[PDB]
Design a binder for this molecule. Structure first.
Ligand SMILES: CC(C)(C)c1nc(-c2ccc[nH]2)c2cc(C(N)=O)c(N)nc2n1
Ligand SMILES: CC(C)(C)c1nc(-c2ccc[nH]2)c2cc(C(N)=O)c(N)nc2n1
Ligand SMILES: Cc1ccc(Cn2cc(C(N)=O)ccc2=O)c(C)c1
Ligand SMILES: Cc1ccc(Cn2cc(C(N)=O)ccc2=O)c(C)c1
Lengths: 317, 317
């Protein structure tokens, strides 16, 4: 035991927990000045004693050197896309198609309804609680190594907030820029004659493609997790909402507007409640993602591959 | 002009037209002995004068040397997969989902209904009427070069039967082995202690994966074209059935049991007529592929990517 290693461990613990309280809960226990006080007290102490500097410390989010290019990562589990509806009738058709396809339809059919954030899909790997790599969705099978960029997102934890983390956990989410940060970014790009982005999705997309993480750190990017990929050394919950609640409990940011619904009539209430709220949310959304809440029924219904919307193989029994 | 080049051109023309009449029309004008008479009269004459031997002659279907391995071909246009139904209710749901999604639903909604052959999907390229390459579907983006194997299929023309062929045409079809040939193949593999296949789909799949085309030539494989890929130097018809009729008119084999239907009630007649016929067709089918006949409405409805069957993005207007 040393005095310095005791101070760094205690500071890092307090700060990672204060980041969790501000970012994930929107309920900080201390003012932003108390957080910074401990933050630059830790950073100064880590430079005075470089021997005890850790890779996943909250002071080490940004890399000092810009990268040569972007590597190629292929997704272990492929990253799935989404089918889309445009009317109450079209949504109700997708629902009847599932009621008639199920071996046993339960009473009621629970759905996990979330907003369809207008951002970029990314992967984040957590090997024994530590962020080892992050990748863009790319084509759904092969993406780019954007780890340095993903490490700069203030609400993306560099370490999971659990003493028993899984062996490997791939968090999957949507990276986006909120309205306030977007407004700020254009006004700064106007007063310094630089690129202005047409909307917050292009602003976030461009910020994540920057080779220098010192530029990405200055962009107000935000992660909201929508699912899990690799899951080793853990027994994940039997429903989608419980898995999202589980991600939140170990340090991962999820959307707060996600609610459960029983049957298409309740699910259509959520679509129109979120539609009124759209005009005063603080970030862009282009609809809602409505999901079957039970993981047994997901594996039962399964997935479609790259196929037409105008052709169906009515298979024989 | 030479006497020999006049005899080869006239023989090749007669034989390619007799193959078309037997294979594509099931209405030959000459007995099988008359066809062979001209065939080995051409082959003998081509070996006596090797200078006039052409690459696409009906005598040159098989390569004398087995290949080293199988190359990797990536599909220019990707090869799409299919979504599937299992009940009258599930098919009617897919149909209502399309009626409600269309900008303008016509009265009536024509469908091109075909049997779902239990074979292997392949690509065949025709550069200015000549068969230059063939590939397996693989993953739908990348497949294997099986040109030598595809050249051995007796009903696959090595040259298109038109004096104005397109610049490039990619025919897409299902390669399969009929019942009679399958029964024959096992009995021969039993009396010569060799591999027996569980069903005609495994027998065809294995025959197409053979490196030696002298082995694939002895397997009774058959192509039935289901669609087109690349189409350069041609204005293709506005409907799916007319494109299939067009393929047949230029030398390509298509299924004869394909019929048009107007509305789900007529389309379900075809599903049950083909279901009774299943037990006496001569080849394996595992259902029916029901397609929107108009190409305008196909491009309008579009295609789904690799996505779940339990998640829908109800997008905002
Ligand atoms: C169904 C599946 C595959 C778990 C999925 N996917 C996406 C998504 C975005 C890009 C590729 N996939 C998604 C994206 C969002 C989003 N944009 O907020 C969401 N709420 N849920 C999503 N769920
Ligand atoms: C809708 C689309 C993409 C034109 C298509 N695809 C297939 C198929 C088989 C394997 C991949 N795709 C197919 C396969 C068959 C078949 N097995 O007879 C068919 N009759 N039609 C098909 N149509
Ligand atoms: C100077 C400064 C420091 C920190 C923050 C925001 N913030 C606050 C906390 C906190 N309250 O526990 C934790 C993390 C964090 O990022 C701002 C806006 C400004
Ligand atoms: C000996 C022999 C030769 C040809 C055939 C079958 N056949 C017939 C014709 C034909 N009638 O115009 C054309 C091509 C072809 O493949 C068999 C079964 C046996």
């Amino acid at each position: 035991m040393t005095n310095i290693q005791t101070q760094l461990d205690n500071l890092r613990k307090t700060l990672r927990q204060y980041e969790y309280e501000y970012h994930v809960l929107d309920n900080p226990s201390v003012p932003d000045s108390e957080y910074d006080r401990l933050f630059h007290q830790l950073k100064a102490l880590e430079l005075e004693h470089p021997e005890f500097l850790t890779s996943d410390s909250p002071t080490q989010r940004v890399g000092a050197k810009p990268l040569s290019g972007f590597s190629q990562i292929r997704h272990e589990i492929p990253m799935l896309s989404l089918d889309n509806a445009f009317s109450d009738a079209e949504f109700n058709a997708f629902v009847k198609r599932i009621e008639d396809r199920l071996i046993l339809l339960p009473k009621p059919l629970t759905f996990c309804c979330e907003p369809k954030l207008d951002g970029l899909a990314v992967s984040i790997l957590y090997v024994n609680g530590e962020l080892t790599q992050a990748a863009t969705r790319g084509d759904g099978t092969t993406g780019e190594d954007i780890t340095a960029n993903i490490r700069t997102i203030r609400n993306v934890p560099l370490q999971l907030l659990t003493d028993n983390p899984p062996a490997r956990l791939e968090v999957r989410g949507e990276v986006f820029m909120p309205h306030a940060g977007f407004e700020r970014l254009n006004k700064y790009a106007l007063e310094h004659n630089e690129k202005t982005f047409a909307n917050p999705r292009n602003a976030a997309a461009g910020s994540l493609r920057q080779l220098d993480p010192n530029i990405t750190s200055k962009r107000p990017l935000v992660l909201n997790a929508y699912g899990i990929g690799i899951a080793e050394g853990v027994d994940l919950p039997t429903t989608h909402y419980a898995r999202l609640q589980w991600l939140k409990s170990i340090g991962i940011p999820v959307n707060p507007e996600i609610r459960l619904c029983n049957g298409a009539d309740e699910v259509l209430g959520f679509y129109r409640d979120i539609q009124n709220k759209r005009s005063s949310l603080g970030y862009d959304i282009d609809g809602t993602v409505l999901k079957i809440n039970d993981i047994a029924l997901q594996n039962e219904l399964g997935f479609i591959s790259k196929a037409p919307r105008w052709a169906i193989a009515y298979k024989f029994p």
